[PDB]
Design a binder for this molecule. Structure first.
Ligand code: ADP
Ligand code: MG
Lengths: 375, 52
């Protein structure tokens, strides 16, 4: 722990938890949001026999644990799970006590207000954090980009959000949430791999196939033409070496998996591709600034490490929108940490401690005070 | 008649000349100056601040 009473910066992103100290450039403890529990009961002795398993421990113990998600698309299952994982993060991973450091947290866009009131109340009772602040990840990604104008595409693991912000002001009237995310990607890839001869249901193979998505997946420039040329495609077809050692070969599926977000009719969504959701979002607001939105679009999330989103994005928007002004996307490398960086940025300036949510305000007005203290 | 015409046109020319005097005083110092954006290529990439 630093000698100074600097604040805690924790991004509880929908899919990854990244925690550390204020003034740091990158979060120190970063782990996926999976939680493992003992698949069977206790009869043995001498070691183990522990209920909750979180972090890399559960990653190593994936096979003998039922792998469960305490949060999915924002919905909260069991607050005890968050209690334990935050205990682990603060003491076993961050080696910090929350008594002496206020916490800045980031929440998924348009999270329930009742969810905020319950989570804040359990937090304040269970923990002894001196002060509090929670913010939407959209403005955090904006801060990471450091440009007040643009539309943020936050692609988490449970929801994809499109949020327009012009000159550093939120536009909730033109903000939308789409239920397509990593979960859907894994599902669709699971069914295609089932049609390829490999049919698995458990979560270990879920992580294997999301790793495959991280490594080999394409974003098709032209879809049906690329499957037509991918009929044989000995060179274009790509293989992976699974940890057991078998060589699993995939061809068109590499670019037929992310395409589903762009083409939701593959597995039955009324909503069109996410580019249509950015398009409608843009026109909902006044006409004039729309060009700037076209030229200032930002994309954020862990998924963004994949190739192909930028070219597809620009080409389709230019197809939909007039091609007079030039559209260009901006995306700094390793932007999944960017939100946490913005949290540090929030703690950088000396005005931030004017609106810390202190203990006594919550003791006076209950959780309801946040309704007036954040917004 | 010539006297009437001279008087009218002289008054008109007097108002015209008083109007010219203002333009004679200044003609360019009313416009703003140039500050177009250009060059800056030599600036570095890792900004001393994190808005990089
Ligand atoms: N290094 C990486 N390369 C590619 N994809 C990644 C990487 N790390 C994480 N991801 C993907 O990002 C997803 C998690 O998104 P996340 O960054 O938590 O969203 P948010 O920005 O809302 O927190 C995971 O499902 C995973 O598939
Ligand atoms: Mg995200």
């Amino acid at each position: 722990d630093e000698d100074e009473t600097t604040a805690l910066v924790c991004d509880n992103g929908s899919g990854l938890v990244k925690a550390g100290f204020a003034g740091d450039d990158a979060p120190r403890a970063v782990f996926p949001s999976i939680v493992g529990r003992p698949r069977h009961q206790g009869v043995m002795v001498g070691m183990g026999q522990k209920d909750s398993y979180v972090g890399d421990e559960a990653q190593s113990k994936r096979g003998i644990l039922t792998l469960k998600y305490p949060i999915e698309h924002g919905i909260i299952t069991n607050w005890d799970d968050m209690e334990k994982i935050w205990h682990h993060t603060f003491y076993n991973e961050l080696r910090v006590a929350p008594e002496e450091h206020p916490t800045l947290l980031t929440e998924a866009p348009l999270n329930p207000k009742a969810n905020r009131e319950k989570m804040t109340q359990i937090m304040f009772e269970t923990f002894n954090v001196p002060a509090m602040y929670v913010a939407i990840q959209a403005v955090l990604s904006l801060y990471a980009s450091g440009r007040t104008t643009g539309i943020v595409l936050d692609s988490g693991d449970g929801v994809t959000h499109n949020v327009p912000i012009y000159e550093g002001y939120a536009l909730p009237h033109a903000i939308m949430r789409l239920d397509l995310a990593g979960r859907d990607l894994t599902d669709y890839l699971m069914k295609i791999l089932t049609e390829r001869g490999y049919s698995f249901v458990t979560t270990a193979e879920r992580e294997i196939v999301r790793d495959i998505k991280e490594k080999l997946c394409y974003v098709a420039l032209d879809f049906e033409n690329e499957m037509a040329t991918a009929a044989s495609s000995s060179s274009l077809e790509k293989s992976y070496e699974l940890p057991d050692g078998q060589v699993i070969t995939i061809g068109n599926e590499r670019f037929r998996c992310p395409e589903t977000l762009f083409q939701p009719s593959f597995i039955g969504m009324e909503s069109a591709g996410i580019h249509e959701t950015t398009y409608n979002s843009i026109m909902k607001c006044d006409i004039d600034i729309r060009k700037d939105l076209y030229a200032n679009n930002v994309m954020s999330g862990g998924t963004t490490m994949y190739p192909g989103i930028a070219d597809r994005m620009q080409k389709e928007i230019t197809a939909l929108a007039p091609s007079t002004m030039k559209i260009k996307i901006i995306a700094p490398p390793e932007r999944k940490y960017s939100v946490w960086i913005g949290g540090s940025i929030l703690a950088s300036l000396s005005t931030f401690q004017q609106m810390w949510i202190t203990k006594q305000e919550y003791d006076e007005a209950g959780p309801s005070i946040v309704h007036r203290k954040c917004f | 008649l010539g006297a009437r015409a001279k008087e009218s046109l002289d008054l008109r020319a007097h108002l015209k000349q008083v109007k010219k005097e203002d333009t004679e005083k200044e003609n360019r110092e009313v416009g703003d100056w140039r500050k177009n954006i250009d060059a800056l290529s030599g600036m570095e990439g890792r900004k001393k601040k994190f808005e990089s």
